[PDB]
Amino acid sequence: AFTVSIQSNKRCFLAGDGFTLTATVAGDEPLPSNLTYTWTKDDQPHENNTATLTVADATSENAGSYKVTVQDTDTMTSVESEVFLMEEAELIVNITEPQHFYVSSQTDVELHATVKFSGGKTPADNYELHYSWSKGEDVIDTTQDITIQEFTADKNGVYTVKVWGESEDSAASASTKIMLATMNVDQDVVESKTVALGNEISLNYVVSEDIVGDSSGMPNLTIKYNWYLQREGQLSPTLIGSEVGEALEGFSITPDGHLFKESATYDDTAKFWCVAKLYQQIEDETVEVAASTSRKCSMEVVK
Numbered sequence: 001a002f003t004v005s006i007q008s009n010k011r012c013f014l015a016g017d018g019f020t021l022t023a024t025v026a027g028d029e030p031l032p033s034n035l036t037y038t039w040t041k042d043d044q045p046h047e048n049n050t051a052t053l054t055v056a057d058a059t060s061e062n063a064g065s066y067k068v069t070v071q072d073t074d075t076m077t078s079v080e081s082e083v084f085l086m087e088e089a090e091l092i093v094n095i096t097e098p099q100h101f102y103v104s105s106q107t108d109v110e111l112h113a114t115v116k117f118s119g120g121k122t123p124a125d126n127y128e129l130h131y132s133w134s135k136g137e138d139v140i141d142t143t144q145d146i147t148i149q150e151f152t153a154d155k156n157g158v159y160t161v162k163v164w165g166e167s168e169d170s171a172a173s174a175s176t177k178i179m180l181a182t183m184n185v186d187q188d189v190v191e192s193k194t195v196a197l198g199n200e201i202s203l204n205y206v207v208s209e210d211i212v213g214d215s216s217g218m219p220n221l222t223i224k225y226n227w228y229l230q231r232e233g234q235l236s237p238t239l240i241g242s243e244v245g246e247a248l249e250g251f252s253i254t255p256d257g258h259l260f261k262e263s264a265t266y267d268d269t270a271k272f273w274c275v276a277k278l279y280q281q282i283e284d285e286t287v288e289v290a291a292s293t294s295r296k297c298s299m300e301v302v303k
């Protein structure tokens with residue numbers, strides 16, 4: 001038996017890679033030792049006439065269906081190989097974290113990069129990928145995964161990871177936009193309020209989202225208002241309501257996050273406060289990124 005096959009040092013290639021194809025003769029011993037090789041790519045003639053065909057700085061042009069015909073010059077028997085299909089692949093690079101997200105204050109943000117080859121094959125088992133992370137004009141690390149330490153409003157921005165193989169010709173990128181989310185308190189709750197028995201109880205805590213720089217593309221932010229009261233000797237605080245609309249003990253919450261009750265009772269005499277929580281909407285899900293708790297108001301129902 002006298003057979004031939006193409007053996008390759010790569011399963012596929014990325015732009016700028018090198019590779020080598022090898023006509024490999026098999027079968028019963030001794031195998032014919034005086035041989036000519038004729039190579040074709042996609043049915044078209046190739047100039048290379050040696051046992052190995054080598055490519056350097058590959059481009060799309062080097063992809064294609066290779067075949068070698070080997071002739072034994074003693075007998076003149078020629079044997080052609082099955083084609084070896086050499087395909088060009090591209091890197092798909094991904095970040096595990098959301099494309100855009102807000103973070104809570106005083107945290108270290110971990111980012112992870114993942115990579116796949118477009119054709120579901122790596123070029124070779126040991127093939128080496130290079131990672132480079134940057135924010136704007138500065139390289140923040142050369143590792144696949146990185147950590148942004150002590151994230152502050154001035155680290156708001158777009159972080160990008162670039163990945164490539166043997167040549168930067170094969171580079172592909174992913175980006176994520178990360179911003180600090182905090183709240184500002186524009187109007188604190190009143191420190192004390194005395195209310196005529198039978199008249200209206202109305203309390204407000206005015207806070208807003210505090211976001212520095214360009215918020216474009218970032219997750220929708222919402223605020224929810226949690227209202228409490230605690231009376232004398234009373235052990236744990238009563239949560240009056242959370243959602244807008246009506247609430248417990250005759251209290252309602254307006255659309256703006258205001259606490260309201262029609263007519264006071266001597267039982268409404270208590271401390272009130274609000275805990276306002278900031279949420280970012282990511283996919284179908286909502287997650288608190290900040291909170292503000294109001295000063296307690298001493299609510300006196302008299303006369």
Ligand SMILES: [Mg+2]
Pocket residue numbers: 110145
């Ligand atoms: Mg980790």
